[PDB]
Design an enzyme around this catalytic site. Structure first.
Site, PDB file in Angstrom:
ATOM      1  N   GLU A   1      -6.441  97.785 -17.663  1.00 58.28           N
ATOM      2  CA  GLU A   1      -6.239  96.404 -18.015  1.00 58.28           C
ATOM      3  C   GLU A   1      -4.894  96.166 -18.669  1.00 58.28           C
ATOM      4  O   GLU A   1      -4.790  95.605 -19.765  1.00 58.28           O
ATOM      5  CB  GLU A   1      -7.368  95.903 -18.921  1.00 58.28           C
ATOM      6  CG  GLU A   1      -8.717  96.040 -18.267  1.00 58.28           C
ATOM      7  CD  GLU A   1      -9.772  95.248 -18.967  1.00 58.28           C
ATOM      8  OE1 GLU A   1      -9.507  94.769 -20.106  1.00 58.28           O
ATOM      9  OE2 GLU A   1     -10.873  95.114 -18.387  1.00 58.28           O
TER      10      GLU A   1
ATOM     11  N   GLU B   1     -15.419  98.602 -14.437  1.00 58.22           N
ATOM     12  CA  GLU B   1     -16.165  98.051 -15.564  1.00 58.22           C
ATOM     13  C   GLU B   1     -16.940  96.858 -15.122  1.00 58.22           C
ATOM     14  O   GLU B   1     -16.473  96.024 -14.377  1.00 58.22           O
ATOM     15  CB  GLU B   1     -15.303  97.572 -16.699  1.00 58.22           C
ATOM     16  CG  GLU B   1     -14.543  98.661 -17.394  1.00 58.22           C
ATOM     17  CD  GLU B   1     -13.735  98.217 -18.550  1.00 58.22           C
ATOM     18  OE1 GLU B   1     -13.900  97.082 -19.060  1.00 58.22           O
ATOM     19  OE2 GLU B   1     -12.845  99.016 -18.958  1.00 58.22           O
TER      20      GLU B   1
END
Ligand SMILES: [Mg+2]
Ligand SMILES: [Mg+2]
Lengths: 489, 489, 489, 489
Positions: D207, D384
């Site tokens: 991320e 995720e």
């Protein structure tokens, strides 16, 4: 500003049983409703709240202070009821009248002056004198008086609601007995004969549809006699029609003043366009059936000349809508809207719901007024409109919004002659007891003091100006939701 | 009834930046706060709302209508701010004054008549004339005027808050620069010199504690310069103390009228009895440190004769409490109470919370008044009290309850001279923009019309009677919870 | 881990009427409850949901899949009911038995083999054979079978609940008629005679206290016959006592297996210490009155030798508490706690409430078990415990918490022999219809498929390990509130 | 059932900083994030929670128990990060490498074996050995290991986030410094060189879009360095692109295993059809800009051959959507949906929101997978997906629903190779601290014990069967709203 005609009445409505008791010497134990709410089984079942009317707001003793507030608020009219049970605590059956009864049909009831005199001998003097006192005071404030003869309680000699609940249908059976129609005509004549000089307009009865419907169909509502019986509901409905017509005639034999009726209304809104027919069926079943009877003489598929033309004006009670969905060729009321909302919830339309679970739907009042006007072209009085709202959260918006809708009706040519808020002060809300607070004025049930909610000050603005003034017009809007209970989704 | 003395002032408070703009010709782009709220990075970060003050309620143009409403409401006082940025959009550094500066300490600032004349040449004429116009109109309504010199925005030439946010501390740094103290003394002298004939009492500044605290510590609040720096917070605090003292002296050189300060207060209530010491530490840190400086000359462990006695009255702003818990020998503010509640939630004490998440805690106002009175025995004016409440759900209760508490303080011997509600009308709530609506009057930001909330009518009752009348005393109570949002548990 | 004895039973409980119908050929129209829930007036009144049992989960046809799931879940016991209405759809009055009846008292009922044979001739063969089939399959999974003879519906020939609702007390009157006691003894003997080889333990009846109480007192609950009559409630209570005793004797004449009863329990917790006496009065009235009758022979102030000792074990149903407050020398149930909570609300104790408005109160199960054990020292089986929870939000916590409490009781010496969850799958919740979902398994009422809620997987852990394993012990806790509905305050 | 291919991976993802600390000897104080969350000013401002990672779940010491649980749950893969700060607590700048740097552009970084040896001399031996130990144990359970090199914290020698927050941009500046790119390439080479035998696939970083965006734009999020600077955000973004590309090359010089990147995704859904273009602009700005750089070499309007083709697979993180509205030719994220919902509220779409205020929107995961697949046709791993849900109220539905959507993508031809839930156990959620609980396993932060939420048992079903089994498919649905918090309307 949204301005009303100079003659337009802004006032309040009030019931005897709901507001009278609470002061010493006021207790009237002699009604079905009094027995009903004190019944231990009813209380234990939760049919009734356990609150008792004798602990109420005390209008019987404190009427001058109620009137003081109304006068301070600029109110020009009041529709207030009298209680049959107070006036005739003992049976009037033995007073002879000329009544044409053909089985279930009471076609006429003529009440002679001799009968009126005999009734006067039997009447409770303190009661009738006290009503004169209260209503004289009311008039002394510049308040026009609409007298409503019946607002649900019956004298116990006419209805033992516990016996009927128990299925002893040989007990005095209230609106299941044609005798009650005849006694009601007697009572109505008597009251007009005694009090007419104080009265501007008469209503025979308040929300008879609630009487028959909650009494015999919607029995979880905890209304007397709570005898689940659809045939009985219809019988009571017919007897209330007949009672209205016979009271109309009896009152007209005494006075030529307008005689109307006050009725519980909802705007029946279709859930979808496909439900429009269903909504019309709901309106017929729940509204036009009664009015076509007392206006057009149409009842049960036949026309009765003794029912036709027995209405001079229509009292529109309005609180919220009912959303209707077709169900086959029938219909059903959609839960979560209208009267069927979560208390202090929000409907699927985004409209907040009152402490009673009633949806904010001012547009309905226009619709109901317009529909009545288009159908019958009889003068309309909004005889109730209000909200159960202990916090005065929604009421200011509710008040202005609904008044605005009355203006809209007026502007469109509906002869609506006034707006009477339910109510000036908190009172006993039937099976719900005191926790449903509809007043512009909050009542402290311990001290009996009246307290002005902010909505009372808003109503004073309206009433004194006969307008929704520029300062308060913004209240013609839906209460903002964020700060209110969201309910459950 | 709960009656106030005949001289007791009921009014409102208002800020320039929060209320002035919105009408043509009113835009003032020349403040730190204006730059701050228009900054794209701030907007994108959600530090500021994205709402802009130039779309505001338009007091600059529409002041007469604000005053009309206040007059209709019976208000007898207004505390209103002037904006330095409007009056001196260009730097005044070059106006020579006699200032004794010893490093960080500004011990004196004398502003000669020559300096005042030079300032007058540099001032924006339209601004100062317009303030005279507005405040003259205000006075023409029988409204006593408390002029507040500073209410957060600084001229941009004194503070480039974006540069400071970015850590360029060589840019104009606002209250981090002693120069700002000196320029403020100049400004304060100038305004008193120009406007004194209109002024009853002066306040040097509004809530300086918010300026230093939100500016440099509570940076998620989105206040300028949003530079997270504890040393800076202290430096700004000291400079605001000094600014207050130097403005006090400068104003007193022109006028002997009372000069006070307005401060953001909370009642610091201990979570348990064991937290009483912690609550006292919180009060010292957050309140007495400033006041002991400007009253007693005590700052940072030393006493300054140039700070002592520089206060004639205390403006108490009060909205809610802060609940304090001991944490070692320190303390912490307990979430879920006071200022730290869920917006439209309910605290663990059962107190409803405003649209800002501020707990209903009127008792705090008594406590804060009593504490200030006991400590300093200087006259107190409640210079702000109000609630963010778009629905007017809590406000009627909030209003009466807090007024009641002021009465209690009075009855107990506190010299409280009036109550000024925040605010007459909705306005721009800083980083929160327009959605936090504190008015007795709702503002329609599109039309700029003012609309009376029911609480405005309640306040009219109070102000016209100088009393909580019998009709409205019931509002001295906690809003009923059932109808309000429950928040989350 | 919290480990149970190796013989301890983990299972489920299930009712015939609630779970059987839904598959073709399963419909049984021949019960009072079936008539009751199809009654148009009841439906229109909202007494019943309008949902019908014939649209139910279909255990009658799909039992093997229910058993498959139970077996996969590791369950070792099931308490399942049989329906009298299925077995004897036609009257059995004419089967002669030797019964000593002295007015209201049925002192004995002896059912001869000849009577059993005559009953067998009258029985519905498909029904009794089908029960053997289902229960044989159940046993084939290693599941111990507790047969419960009665779980509310009566054959219509014994009770016309609509006639009784209407107050026609000469109609077949169910538990108001001693005849029903005698027919029940016949039925109980018959079922034991037919099915004993499949049965580990018998229960005569399920929650007779709900039958008498909801039938005749708490009439808003919508249970048959919904005839508000306190004397009737007592008469039904006495007849259920007598029915239990006469069934006990009749079953014991056939089999020496344990014969018990299953009863609806609450922990009666005093609101304050001052209410402890009131809580004890509530326990007596609501629990000990029945058990002292069937254990000690004590009924109505007299002792009956024909009632004494008629109980081998006690089935504890437990869902939540009732909070009790003294009211004079009486008591009242405090709203907002226990069974009287807002659906998906939170009690004043901070305990979340189920979809039924029942408070999370696992500690009550220990208390109820301990109290029964201390009073009678009869073996206890937790025959129901569960939650209406469509989301499986609270159930995992509910399950583990209550199982933990059973362990606590065990550890303290209570002979509790197992824990039966209510229920394996969603089913028809009486007047509430299908929306109250108590299953570990969710039922899709359209497809009749069973779906495992996560709680089913938790229960599998418990049942397979006979323990609250280390992995799941954390579920012995109150569901976190923040994510759940807060209800109204 | 919804069945996955036999090779499809079901597992979990985990970060070093979020999960490692909490056991003795685990504390790593040597990262920017550690300094950041301990910074007093940050804590006092509420930028960070005040919770500290050293009080965390203790994977560093307790990894075997985490792996035990994963193995018991049937998990076949883990993506776990290593912490640069642990491995190189001291600067590696002096290790010479061959890097072509042209101003802001790092075009190549070659890390020789000599450099690797010098790095090995400088590395923290306990750290790298311990990672081998943990990851060897992981592999010993039949769990495939995806090693993620970077998951936000930087060694403090590379970034003094407090200095940068303060605007001292000459302090070590993290991703604002091209040096960090070069050191990252060194680090990445080193880790691959040391650990490759344990690794199935590499991810360079997790991320990065959150790093640049929250670091420099969304500064109220409380991420380091919290320096509001749009240019800085872009500079950091470019350096993260370059870091990815240079790490890809450095890792490929050591191993030919797949090297990918893990990225924070939302489905950008248009509020109305008219917002479709706006939604596409949002996708470009927030997603394709990065991927077109590392896949196609397109950055800032130019193409770089040194960026092209630097991606073997894409790790899709997905939690919820962002609803997009056109704003002129720009766009804005609509509050109340997606990531911008009330914590434990409900969106306007009727979708419940997590403890983080994230909307239930499983359909987004299909969309994001499909869009990536259509654009690049690179293998996808859902790296995720999870929910902050302390009660396990929504998680069971969240889990199954999102897994179902992955199946849909697969069925439609997307090469998605597995699903990794965030996370196996609760962990430190950055600025939010420990109260955001994403685990299938609840962590007791006092005891460090792991506790199975019911969703863990559901995931075991999925993982062991490689299917959404028939028993749990019903969880592919939206959590029922009634029992959940409704939020505010
Ligand atoms: Mg209000
Ligand atoms: Mg759950």
């Amino acid at each position: 500003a949204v301005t009303f005609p100079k003659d337009f009445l802004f006032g309040w409505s009030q019931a005897g049983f709901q507001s009278e008791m609470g002061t010493p010497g006021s207790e009237d134990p002699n009604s079905d409703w009094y027995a009903w709410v004190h019944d231990r089984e009813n209380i234990a079942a939760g049919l009734v709240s356990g609150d008792f009317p004798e602990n109420g707001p005390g209008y019987w003793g404190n009427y001058r202070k109620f009137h003081d507030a109304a006068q301070a608020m600029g109110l020009t009219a009041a529709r207030i009821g009298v209680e049959w049970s107070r006036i005739f605590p003992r049976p009037t059956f033995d007073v002879k009248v000329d009544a044409e009864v053909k089985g279930d049909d009471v076609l006429s009831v003529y009440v002679s002056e001799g009968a009126l005199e005999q009734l006067d001998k039997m009447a409770n003097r303190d009661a009738i004198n006290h009503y004169r006192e209260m209503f004289s005071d009311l008039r002394s404030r510049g308040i026009t008086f609409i007298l409503n003869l019946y607002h649900w309680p019956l004298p116990l000699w006419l209805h033992d609601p516990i016996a009927i609940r128990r299925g002893n249908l040989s007990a005095p059976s209230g609106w299941l007995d044609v005798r009650t129609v005849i006694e009601f005509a007697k009572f109505s004549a008597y009251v007009a004969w005694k009090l007419d000089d104080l009265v501007y307009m008469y209503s025979t009865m308040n929300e008879p549809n609630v009487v028959w419907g909650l009494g015999y169909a919607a029995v979880k509502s905890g209304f007397p006699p709570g005898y689940l019986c659809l045939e009985c509901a219809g019988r009571a409905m017919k007897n209330l029609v007949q009672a209205h017509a016979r009271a109309y005639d009896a009152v007209k034999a005494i006075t030529k003043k307008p005689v109307g009726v006050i009725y519980a209304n909802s705007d029946f809104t279709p859930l979808t366009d496909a439900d429009r027919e269903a909504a019309e069926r709901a309106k017929f079943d729940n509204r036009w059936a009664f009015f076509d009877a007392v206006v057009r003489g149409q009842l049960g598929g036949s026309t009765r000349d003794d029912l036709k033309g027995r209405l001079d004006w229509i009292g529109v009670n309005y609180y919220t809508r009912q959303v209707v969905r077709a169900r086959g060729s029938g219909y059903e009321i959609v839960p979560g809207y209208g009267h069927g909302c979560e208390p202090n919830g929000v409907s699927p339309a985004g409209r907040p719901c009152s402490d009673f679970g009633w949806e904010f739907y001012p547009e309905g009042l226009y619709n109901v007024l317009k529909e009545y006007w288009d159908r019958y072209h009889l003068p309309l009085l909004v005889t109730e409109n209000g909200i159960a709202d202990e916090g005065d959260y929604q009421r200011p918006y509710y008040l202005v919004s609904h008044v605005y809708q009355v203006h809209r009706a007026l502007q469109d040519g509906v002869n609506v002659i006034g707006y009477l808020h339910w109510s000036l002060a908190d009172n006993y809300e039937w099976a719900s007891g005191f926790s449903k607070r509809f007043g512009l004025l909050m009542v402290d049930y311990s001290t009996k003091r009246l307290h002005w909610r902010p909505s009372a000050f808003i109503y004073r603005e309206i009433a004194k100006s006969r307008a929704i003034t520029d300062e308060i017009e913004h209240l013609n809007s839906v209460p903002p939701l964020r700060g209110l209970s969201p309910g459950h989704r």
